């Protein structure tokens, strides 16, 4: 449990999803251009008006927490106050606008991450800089700031850009999010993250800490699954794939060591398949089995068992095996698997009548074959459904991806792809 922080970290969350702002900006720009967004606001009693036709909206770094920082360059427009009109062509404001997850009234099972403009009684829109180009000053700046907010709030219905769609239900049930937060992150580009938990546990004490390495190797899209979810949903149903028909998922379980970590144990005797040694078949039994993450990217497997001589069951061996099995993702054939240990360790104890050399020779062979059989069977393949995983819950701009680029095990399990 000491090595919990030494690899990739979900920081107490279950599944973390990320997208590059470079990717989002592409779609946001298309959205602003295609819809020819203009904001008007008028107040005849107070003799004020404003018109803004936007060049673009562009996300930039520096956004705090659950705000995006954005530039909203105005290509043309004006405001008018005390019989004075001010030209807004070439004015380049920097705002911060809150994102929130919104309900869809005809579908409880999809949430959408969108801009939240709030109201005059909150700060869901903040003015960072009135004009990055330095053209507004004094009274002009003061009135512009007021009228900009007026115009944004009044024209809130015009902006429905979907940053991400979130599926409450899905084909991959173990991913279904119960609670979720948005966080913007600035790497040493910029990253938009959604942090999720898949149960109703208390999140009020979790921070908005996120591991920027989720979008490492210049990845466009990524996700990080907790150690515990990886063990439960990717390892538990595959570790016994080479152990024969009598050893299956139901013989094992995950022991939790925190909300986000755990290890795997057997819950019953593991009845190995029959092994033919000379003329007879022999049936090893594994009584204790443990499996935990080791050095972030390996499984350390410790087990104890015995094997009795068929037809002479009084004669038997105890054995113990310790195997270290490294995760590999082959980027060519798309297989994700745990390698067989090339240098496993073992020990054994024979139980034989003193001086019985015949039984010794038989037991020696049976014990060796049993240990080698088990050692060779401890490596196994994951099901590669990684494109489906990255498309299951969060679709950034409601778009699916097609290409996974990297798959890493480092405490958490990280799938990265192209947008």
From Swiss-Prot:
UniProtKB keywords:
Virulence
Induction of expression: The toxin locus has divergently transcribed operons maximally expressed during early stationary phase. This is part of the p47-ntnh-botA operon. The crude toxin extract was isolated from cells that had been growing statically for 96 hours (at protein level).
User: What's a Pfam family this protein contains?
Assistant: Clostridium_P47
Q: How does it assemble?
A: Part of a crude toxin extract that includes BoNTA2/NTNH, P47, OrfX2 and OrfX3; OrfX1 was not detected.
**Domain note:** An elongated protein with a middle beta-sheet wrapped around a long alpha-helix. Structurally similar to tubular lipid-binding (TULIP) superfamily proteins. The N-terminal domain (residues 35-175) folds very similarly to OrfX2 (residues 6-168), another protein of the same locus. This structure is very similar to OrfX3 in the OrfX1-OrfX3 complex from P.bifermentans (AC A0A5P3XKL3, PDB:8BGM).
**Similarity comment: family membership:** Belongs to the TULIP P47 family.
Q: What does this protein do?
A: Part of a botulinum neurotoxin type A2 (BoNT) locus; may be part of a progenitor toxin complex required to protect BoNT during its passage through the host gastrointestinal tract.
Q: What is this protein called?
A: Protein P47
- The species is Clostridium botulinum (strain Kyoto / Type A2)
